[PDB]
Amino acid sequence: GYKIRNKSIFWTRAGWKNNWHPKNFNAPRPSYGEFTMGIRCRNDHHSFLRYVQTYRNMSRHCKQYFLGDKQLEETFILGLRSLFLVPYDSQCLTDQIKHGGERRFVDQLDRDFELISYNTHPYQLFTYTVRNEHLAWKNEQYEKIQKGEKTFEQELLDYLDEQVLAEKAKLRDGQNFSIERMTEIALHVFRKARAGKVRPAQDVRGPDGNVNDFLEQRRPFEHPNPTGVTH
Amino acid sequence: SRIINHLRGDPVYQDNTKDVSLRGTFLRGKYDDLPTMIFFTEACDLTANWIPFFTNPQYDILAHRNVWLLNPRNFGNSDRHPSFDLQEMSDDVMRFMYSQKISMATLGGHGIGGKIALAVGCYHAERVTGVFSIDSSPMDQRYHEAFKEFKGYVNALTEINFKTWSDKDVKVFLKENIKDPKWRSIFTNNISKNAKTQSDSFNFEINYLNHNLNFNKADSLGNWAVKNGIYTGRAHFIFPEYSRWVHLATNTLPMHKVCARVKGFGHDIFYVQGDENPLNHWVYDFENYANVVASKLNKFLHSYDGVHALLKDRTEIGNFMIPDRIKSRNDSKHIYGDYSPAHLHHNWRFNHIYEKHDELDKKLN
Amino acid sequence: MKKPMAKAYEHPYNSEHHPLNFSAVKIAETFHDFIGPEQVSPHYESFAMSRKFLLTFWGGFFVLNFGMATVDLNWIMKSTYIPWIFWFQLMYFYVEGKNSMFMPLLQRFYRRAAANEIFTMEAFYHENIENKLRNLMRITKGQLEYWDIHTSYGEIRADSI
Amino acid sequence: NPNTEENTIDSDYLAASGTVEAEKEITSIDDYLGLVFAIAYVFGVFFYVHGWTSMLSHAVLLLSCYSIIIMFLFILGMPTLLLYDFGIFFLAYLKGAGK
Amino acid sequence: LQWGSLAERPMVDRVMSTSTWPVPYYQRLFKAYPIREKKDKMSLLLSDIDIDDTNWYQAKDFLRGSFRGRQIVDYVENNIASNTYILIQQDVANMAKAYVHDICG
Amino acid sequence: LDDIENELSFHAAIWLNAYADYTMFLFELEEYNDPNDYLMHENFDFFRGLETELEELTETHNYIPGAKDDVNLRGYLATQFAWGKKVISFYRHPADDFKCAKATKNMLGR
Amino acid sequence: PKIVNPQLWPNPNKLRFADLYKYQGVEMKKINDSIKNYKAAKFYIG
Amino acid sequence: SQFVAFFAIVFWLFLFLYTFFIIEKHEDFFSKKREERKKKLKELWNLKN
Amino acid sequence: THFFNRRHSSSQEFIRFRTYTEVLLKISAYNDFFYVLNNYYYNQKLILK
Amino acid sequence: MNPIQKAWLKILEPVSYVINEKMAKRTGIIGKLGRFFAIGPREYGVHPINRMFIFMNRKYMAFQAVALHR
Amino acid sequence: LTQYVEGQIVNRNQLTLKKQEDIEQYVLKLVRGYFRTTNKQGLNINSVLQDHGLDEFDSIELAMQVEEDLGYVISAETIPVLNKVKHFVNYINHVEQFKAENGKAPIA
Amino acid sequence: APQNLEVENILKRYHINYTQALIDELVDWKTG
Amino acid sequence: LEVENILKRYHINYTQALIDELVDWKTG
Ligand SMILES: CCCCCCCCCCCCCCCCCC(=O)OC[C@H](COP(=O)([O-])OCC(O)COP(=O)([O-])OC[C@@H](COC(=O)CCCCCCCCCCCCCCCCC)OC(=O)CCCCCCCCCCCCCCCCC)OC(=O)CCCCCCCCCCCCCCCCC
Ligand SMILES: CCCCCCCCCCCCCCCCCC(=O)OC[C@H](COP(=O)([O-])OCC(O)COP(=O)([O-])OC[C@@H](COC(=O)CCCCCCCCCCCCCCCCC)OC(=O)CCCCCCCCCCCCCCCCC)OC(=O)CCCCCCCCCCCCCCCCC
Ligand SMILES: CCCCCCCCCCCCCCCCCC(=O)OC[C@H](COP(=O)([O-])OCC(O)COP(=O)([O-])OC[C@@H](COC(=O)CCCCCCCCCCCCCCCCC)OC(=O)CCCCCCCCCCCCCCCCC)OC(=O)CCCCCCCCCCCCCCCCC
Ligand SMILES: CCCCCCCCCCCCCCCCCC(=O)OC[C@H](COP(=O)([O-])OCC[N+](C)(C)C)OC(=O)CCCCCCCCCCCCCCCCC
Ligand SMILES: COC1=C(OC)C(=O)C(C/C=C(\C)CC/C=C(\C)CC/C=C(\C)CC/C=C(\C)CC/C=C(\C)CC/C=C(\C)CC/C=C(/C)CCC=C(C)C)=C(C)C1=O
């Protein structure tokens, strides 16, 4: 498609693709015991234990609002680990960060936990919204099954199972029903089923099989254009 | 066999410009009822060179539309007429669509074939859903170095007399005069022997073409006249980054000048990122150029081709309402408001799908 | 099928119209609700080019309206002379003079060129991401070749005996 | 479209060019960023940046006259707060060991 | 429920429109988005992520919906000496040696 | 034999799940066209989850662009001709300050 | 309340054209969210 | 010239003389975690991601 | 910057790691078509061979 | 749609019957008058002032959160 | 004392092991119950958690579950040394011995 | 149909990537 | 050389042995 042509795109004054120690004038310089009277420094060796406690806090304080959903707790753990494994897997040399990458990431996670303790972190609100929509769709499938009715997902699977039998009963020269062939069969059914949601299937024509739907249409009288002029 | 169907005919020299019939290869799509696409190859280029492009499972173009690899007049298998007027050649396609029972079709082209495809949209816009032009622009190319070489090769090809020259004489003449490797191979494959080993001859009419190019006037195939007008429909242009035919500096302006609905670069006009190579004009030979052209072609056919001008994409069909001009409808007791424009079936003229769906609609009510 | 949970937690202070947290996305939605959608014109010529004579009348009407109202227009012209000379001689180089004199000052151009390349990348987003997936689909298909070998082991064992 | 509208192109890249200067290690950019805005109306008078405040008061340069005072007071307090951060040893940080 | 013809495509793909003169001058700037609803569509961020823990976790979720799948999950998590659930086959050692121990009979 | 029959089954189920991920993305990508002609909030709806990540940056005051991105490609494109060409350091917060100060026998802390 | 329809044109089917009927509902839904804020602020304002 | 010299002396040079950053570290657990994490993902890197 | 990097900064010679939101969307926000395609693959290849 | 528009609809219910039912479907001058003054939901009924407040309120509030969170 | 379990409020019960055989059975059931643990039957007393798909962060989740079942308050300094099944068994023994000798819980 | 298998097996031994269009053209080339 | 030409059109690297098997397939 399109590639960056500038060969010097990742060059910095500190080297190639260096986002851990950008070059500045006030560079770090060593200290000597014999010659140093006093010092004001905030660096310590408390980041490791703060990294462990922050995980326990962020994990436990978030499970307070999971209502015991076991599958949500395990999903959250996988997501929480992806946030803590950033310094270990990134291309950036996190052990070479300017003034200590360990302290920087620990203080960054503390700001996240502060929002977590108040149940106002955007990851939390996003989890509640996503899970509610998922449970509403699972409850819809459950209520249809209790009524003995067939779900829309089960009808697709049974329809896909019968199309495979039809395509393989004519495939005698070759006998490799590859995953590529299976996929394009399911995708073709999906495109017709997706278009069928906005225009349902009334007759044998099937989902979205009416040409009259695409003739000239007008807004209903009880719902005109609310935002702009029509003429 | 089944997917590749090229109707066999013999070129007929016609005195009347209206008794001209076009021949070509038809490629059947994967699905039952799909709109058709009419594609024109470069001038003096084989239609078969585009078969692997349009029948590539990776690109899967036939999943969208049926493809007609059609030859223009004086080219390949079609009838011969000395005139190369774009309006007369455009009316040839309309008689072809009628004889083949095609109501409306997508138009494509490569190089000069791109000009021909766009000309049909200029003269018959109501029969054309869209135009996809590959490495071309509606501009006077009589002074482009790439066209001058093609014009020079056709002139040198008039020197060969098939009656007196032997096969070895022709092979030497082509290698020495035609330095471009692709033009050389194309012109060799155009040489064919008639029935009863009468003699050899080019598939294209070399006399009629040479006079058109050598005269170098308004009717030349390199020229784009103001007479052609404006194309009002959907148009997409794709060409290499370093193309000898379309220069990115100024050769895009003709697209805005002729095509009314072209938005600009990055929306309807793209360049394929590539190196400087005089053979980059033939995008189907290189996979890098072909992959980008095919993806942009699939995007055009799927979402932009045959969509109303004021709609963004095909996704807005049925959910976007277009403003109406006042006093535009015959009904006097009409409350003017926004409407969604009507989109019709691709061959509604020659089928009864509207009559059949009317009766199925009454069974519901 | 096991009975799923009735509902997850519902935050008592987060709504779709009044989101608790802030971002430019919600401001973008409230902004386009204010200016409204794109005012699509159904005509064949623009409004200004079709009413050039009429717009010229009202343009000069309001010029005369201001001119007839402003009795002291000459006092405003003279009071504007010094700031007109001052601000144009002071800012000439930074606006226009830099293009042919001592320094170019191409900072604003560099930002246009970076945006033009980003615009092009977005235009080819489909092609670039599809090429990236083809390599992942190649690795995925390479791992699926092992299950295809084991499925035929039963046929090999049957014919081997 | 952040890539076609030159108004957001200028403002986005300009803001990014300023915040990246936090790598120069002056101090917390979250602190002095507000001082940059006030300072920009002292020297921005040269570029007429104060034009949008012409009707906000009876003095066109009201915001600029306050900003030069803010710029003077907060710059004067920077060395004072630095000596406070040093502590009682602050004189050793300046001159070093006595003689 | 009706499915129509598998050989045909949706009617949206088959409907078309052509232009004529005169033509509206207006060029559309943006796509209309009057109502902020994009339900039932998956996020396009899930594009080119490599294999990870979410793959074997979601595999068990869908496998446990079947009888045969429940047997596979319980057997793998109990009777397979692997230090990870991200199973990667780079050799046929365990495959070939499992065949020679069975084809002897 | 039943040990590898169930091992290769779960192994295929993992990579079939990844195959379905890539397939369903290309399926959803068909409804996405002209990324330059969408509104700001509609483009973020296609890429659901980007608004949430943008809110986390705002609520934690990580308003330095590209600080939590491993490859700030946008940062490199903006600084191709910048004086003192540099990008923001990884996970740099605008409020943190690691400045030190020492007193030695020499002046100015030397 | 019921709205008198002149019936000068047939309205589109709700199942075939669902997007045309949604704007009215989401508009009142926004107001309901604002009323929740007005009621919850009774003790602070009071 | 005076605009550059003002900020280059009041803020840049002034803080260069009286402040600094130490080169010694008190903790280095990121370096050893990244090495162990790299061995855990060796099989995936062999597939060339 | 966030919208561009999260959609254009990935490369094939590096591993793209899943974020928190991308974990929740794959596991708890899949649509019906995704659910069908996985069970369709599992039934045809792992069960029905 | 807002409750004030619904309150208008309850009061204009007899007026809605005279214009929409009787006058609107007639022909001539009475028909043109009824179709022009038809009663229902408003076309282009959005209030830009209300929308202007919502935008500036959300934009200014995001600034308050940054300036206060120190 | 009560917690939600699948949307239902269930009273949480605490265990008191006070026996070597019961501590080993609890830790094995604890580690096997974790959804990231591989080769659950190959897990024994001398099993390194790394060999079963567990890292430093999984030990935190396991230590968090020990506080839920036993009522312990485990400090952040102790968690990173629990990398084997034997380590959990010895730590639980040390906590029971400490409370039996000092009459109070260890420092948290 | 039978001629398709003859060409496909020939292309199979040379481990050459083949498409149905190529086979249809080769088969048409044989009859032609 | 018709067999060579169709193979050339598809951009398939062909050996001399393949061409002979195809020619023999048609002639035989
Ligand atoms: C009691 C008696 C008195 C009352 C009686 C009643 C009288 C009422 C009068 C109202 C008249 C009817 C109103 C109709 C609409 C307004 C008229 C109009 O021309 O709009 C069409 C015109 C576009 O129409 P179009 O053809 O359909 O658009 C097609 C394209 O999309 C357009 O863009 P494109 O680039 O794609 O296409 C080309 C484009 C090229 O032209 C342009 O695009 C213009 C480029 C300018 C934009 C650059 C950015 C600068 C503006 C940024 C925003 C500033 C405002 C917000 C900030 C401050 C907040 C308060 O258009 C043209 O070809 C030429 C355009 C017209 C000629 C030049 C116009 C100059 C005068 C109009 C502007 C007045 C400015 C203020 C002066 C008045 C003092 C207050 O609108 C504009 O260009 C902007 C004007 C918007 C309205 C504001 C002014 C309203 C009053 C104007 C009255 C007539 C002028 C009087 C003063 C004349 C001084 C010389
Ligand atoms: C250290 C910086 C300099 C400090 C000196 C004092 C200030 C300069 C005063 C005179 C200005 C002439 C030089 C042009 C400078 C243009 C720089 C510029 O405007 O930025 C463009 C630049 C990007 O635009 P560009 O187009 O790529 O720039 C290239 C130029 O267009 C052109 O491209 P270029 O590659 O050729 O530029 C390279 C640069 C090379 O500069 C250097 O490398 C510096 C030289 C080495 C250091 C020497 C200074 C040593 C200082 C220590 C000694 C001090 C002792 C004091 C007492 C002791 C105290 C203890 O310029 C030169 O080549 C200078 C040679 C001058 C040619 C002279 C030929 C004979 C002319 C005879 C007639 C003269 C008539 C002049 C009329 C009156 C003046 C208008 O923007 C930035 O870099 C932004 C960051 C700012 C950089 C740091 C601040 C430097 C000052 C920038 C101005 C303020 C920007 C910040 C506010 C922005 C708005 C919010
Ligand atoms: C017109 C306006 C005029 C004024 C304008 C300017 C305004 C100035 C305000 C600036 C800020 C002032 C606020 C100071 C905050 C103090 C807070 C505090 O208490 O923290 C303690 C803190 C010391 O604690 P540390 O450093 O953190 O650590 C301590 C070590 O751990 C400890 O290590 P160690 O145990 O080894 O140390 C041993 C011990 C040893 O100490 C000794 O040397 C001992 C001395 C001998 C005692 C007598 C022994 C007698 C023995 C008799 C024996 C009798 C027995 C004989 C035998 C009997 C037998 C039975 O040293 C100490 O610990 C004592 C240090 C504490 C002294 C506090 C000094 C601040 C007093 C300020 C007075 C005025 C405040 C007014 C503020 C009102 C608001 C503006 O004090 C400071 O940090 C002082 C910082 C001052 C820096 C700011 C200077 C700003 C520049 C001002 C002058 C500008 C001149 C140029 C002007 C140009 C035009 C603009
Ligand atoms: C008008 C709208 C609002 C605008 C607000 C202001 C916008 C500012 C936009 C960013 C410009 C900031 C300039 C900083 C220096 C950039 C150049 C650089 O990094 O030096 C590298 C330079 C340049 O090296 P170079 O390699 O990058 O470029 C060399 C130039 N060429 C390539 C042509 C050879 O190298 C140095 O080491 C010189 C160090 C001198 C540093 C001087 C900095 C003084 C100012 C910084 C402190 C200011 C504090 C102000 C805060 C006040 C708080 C109250
Ligand atoms: C608290 O934190 C903050 C915010 O929240 C985050 C902000 O948004 C903001 C930004 C502020 C804004 C975006 C608002 C900007 C508003 C501005 C500049 C002025 C607004 C002016 C108007 C809307 C004009 C209104 C016109 C009128 C009131 C006159 C006409 C109305 C009349 C005569 C009605 C008579 C009034 C009454 C009877 C009073 C009773 C009150 C009622 C509501 C009764 C209404 C009755 C009926 C029948 C509708 C700030 C500064 C802030 O500090």
Residue numbers in the entry:
A (entry chain h): 38 to 268
B (entry chain t): 94 to 458
C (entry chain b): 62 to 222
D (entry chain a): 200 to 298
E (entry chain s): 22 to 126
F (entry chain d): 125 to 234
G (entry chain r): 5 to 50
H (entry chain a): 398 to 446
Sentences from the paper on this structure:
The F-type ATP synthase (F1Fo-ATP synthase) is responsible for generating most of the cellular adenosine triphosphate (ATP) from adenosine diphosphate (ADP) and inorganic phosphate through rotary catalysis. In eukaryotes, ATP synthases are found in the inner mitochondrial membrane. The type III ATP synthase was detected in ciliates where it induces tubulation of the cristae membranes. In this study, we present the cryo-EM structures of the type III ATP synthase dimer and tetramer with associated lipids from the model organism Tetrahymena thermophila in complex with the natural inhibitor IF1.
